[PDB]
Amino acid sequence: SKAAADDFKEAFLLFDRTGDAKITASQVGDIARALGQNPTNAEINKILGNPSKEEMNAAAITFEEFLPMLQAAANNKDQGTFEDFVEGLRVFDKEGNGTVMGAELRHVLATLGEKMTEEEVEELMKGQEDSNGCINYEAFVKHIMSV
Amino acid sequence: FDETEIEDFKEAFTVIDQNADGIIDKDDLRETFAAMGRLNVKNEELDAMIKEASGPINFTVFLTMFGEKLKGADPEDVIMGAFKVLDPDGKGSIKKSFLEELLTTGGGRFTPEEIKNMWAAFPPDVAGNVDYKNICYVITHGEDA
Amino acid sequence: FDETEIEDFKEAFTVIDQNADGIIDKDDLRETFAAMGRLNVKNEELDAMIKEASGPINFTVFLTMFGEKLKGADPEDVIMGAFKVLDPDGKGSIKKSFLEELLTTGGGRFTPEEIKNMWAAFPPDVAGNVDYKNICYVITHGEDA
Numbered sequence: 112s113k114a115a116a117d118d119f120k121e122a123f124l125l126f127d128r129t130g131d132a133k134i135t136a137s138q139v140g141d142i143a144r145a146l147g148q149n150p151t152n153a154e155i156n157k158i159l160g161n162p163s164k165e166e167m168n169a170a171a172i173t174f175e176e177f178l179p180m181l182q183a184a185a186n187n188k189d190q191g192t193f194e195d196f197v198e199g200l201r202v203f204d205k206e207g208n209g210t211v212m213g214a215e216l217r218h219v220l221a222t223l224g225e226k227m228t229e230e231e232v233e234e235l236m237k238g239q240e241d242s243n244g245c246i247n248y249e250a251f252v253k254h255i256m257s258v
Numbered sequence: 259f260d261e262t263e264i265e266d267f268k269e270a271f272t273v274i275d276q277n278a279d280g281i282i283d284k285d286d287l288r289e290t291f292a293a294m295g296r297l298n299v300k301n302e303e304l305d306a307m308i309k310e311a312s313g314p315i316n317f318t319v320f321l322t323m324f325g326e327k328l329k330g331a332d333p334e335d336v337i338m339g340a341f342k343v344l345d346p347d348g349k350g351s352i353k354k355s356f357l358e359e360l361l362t363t364g365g366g367r368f369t370p371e372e373i374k375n376m377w378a379a380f381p382p383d384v385a386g387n388v389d390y391k392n393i394c395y396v397i398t399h400g401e402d403a
Numbered sequence: 404f405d406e407t408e409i410e411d412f413k414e415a416f417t418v419i420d421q422n423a424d425g426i427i428d429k430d431d432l433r434e435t436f437a438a439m440g441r442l443n444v445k446n447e448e449l450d451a452m453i454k455e456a457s458g459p460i461n462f463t464v465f466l467t468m469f470g471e472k473l474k475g476a477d478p479e480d481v482i483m484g485a486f487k488v489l490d491p492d493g494k495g496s497i498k499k500s501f502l503e504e505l506l507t508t509g510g511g512r513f514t515p516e517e518i519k520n521m522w523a524a525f526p527p528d529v530a531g532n533v534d535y536k537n538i539c540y541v542i543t544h545g546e547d548a
Contacts, residue, residue: 128366295463382484402405 119146119181123174134177136170142177143184149191150184152225158183193256200248210245259325260333271320282315284308337394345390354386404470405478416465427460429453482539490535499531 140155220232240246274290275282284304291299361368377385384393419435420427429449436444490497506513522530529538
């Protein structure tokens with residue numbers, strides 16, 4: 112709205128590697144996340160196809176399409192409730208203390224639903240899981256929502 | 259510009275300014291080259307060095323000319339800092355394809371063609387991204403060591 | 404000529420120039436040979452070394468004389484680079500007949516007669532093309548190790 116945030120246009124100049132002021136359709140998922148929006152990858156996929164837009168063939172972009180797609184994704188930020196994120200992992204391990212065994216969270220984050228690479232899974236556990244093999248998800252989900 | 263790097267340029271300015279008056283003229287350039295072994299140094303090379311300045315080469319004109327050509331010059335300890343963050347487990351030289359992918363995919367300065375020029379005199383190990391350290395040496399002091 | 408190879412020739416020039424004035428004369432040649440154990444070094448050997456130069460042996464005359472005799476001299480890391488491309492799976496020394504066929508059939512410098520001279524002091528393994536690495540050693544530093 113501007114509140115006209117012109118820093119979204121300045122961040123588009125940091126993600127366009129050619130400097131022509133266009134951003135390919137394959138970058139739009141990760142740049143919506145870097146502007147403070149977490150649409151799921153199936154949602155980013157649907158919307159695209161919904162608009163008869165094929166992410167399979169070469170793509171370019173213009174700021175005039177990327178701005179309204181970020182504004183259509185911005186209504187879905189009401190789905191980001193931290194009660195359900197901590198209660199999900201609280202149902203994932205027994206006893207009254209928030210600890211996932213290391214390999215349980217790593218294999219679930221790579222193979223269940225939207226596949227996260229094991230390189231990204233190791234980069235998200237690095238520091239929050241110590242050598243006991245127990246990830247405290249009270250501080251883990253706190254630090255994941257700090258970015 | 260750190261102060262020891264500016265003192266290194268002050269020592270190089272004094273070795274090329276053999277009249278010790280504070281201004282490197284064309285005779286100082288020719289007599290420093292003749293003392294390094296250049297008996298055939300042409301006057302057109304000395305004139306092309308003086309044509310890069312708008313005035314006489316005193317210490318601040320030599321510092322501003324080197325500043326404007328070395329606007330991305332990085333000391334060896336900060337280049338090894340960044341390469342220790344790229345190899346955060348220490349000791350190992352990082353893979354060739356990992357440096358090619360991370361140069362391109364992060365920045366436009368890491369585009370490929372430029373990566374072929376990086377491999378081209380920075381040899382294999384250096385180019386590949388396996389060794390490490392020899393490239394920090396030749397970025398702070400050029401030519402083969 | 405890489406710069407560390409030129410620094411190795413500067414250190415060898417300083418060990419043969421025992422007067423430390425920058426010019427290796429015939430007395431320096433004889434006193435370096437006597438300090439290595441050559442008590443019978445003839446004056447005709449010293450005169451044949453000086454007869455390869457047109458002037459006194461200063462550092463740039465010694466570098467140009469070694470440059471003109473070593474116009475295909477290759478450092479050990481680039482010889483092992485080429486032998487790792489000939490054995491691209493790593494570890495194994497390459498076959499005798501494979502190096503004889505690939506030397507001949509690619510280039511005139513790899514003709515046979517020359518291949519018999521390669522096997523002749525570069526022993527079997529080396530000659531054969533099975534070992535590897537000892538030949539890179541003796542091409543950068545001669546004689547049996």
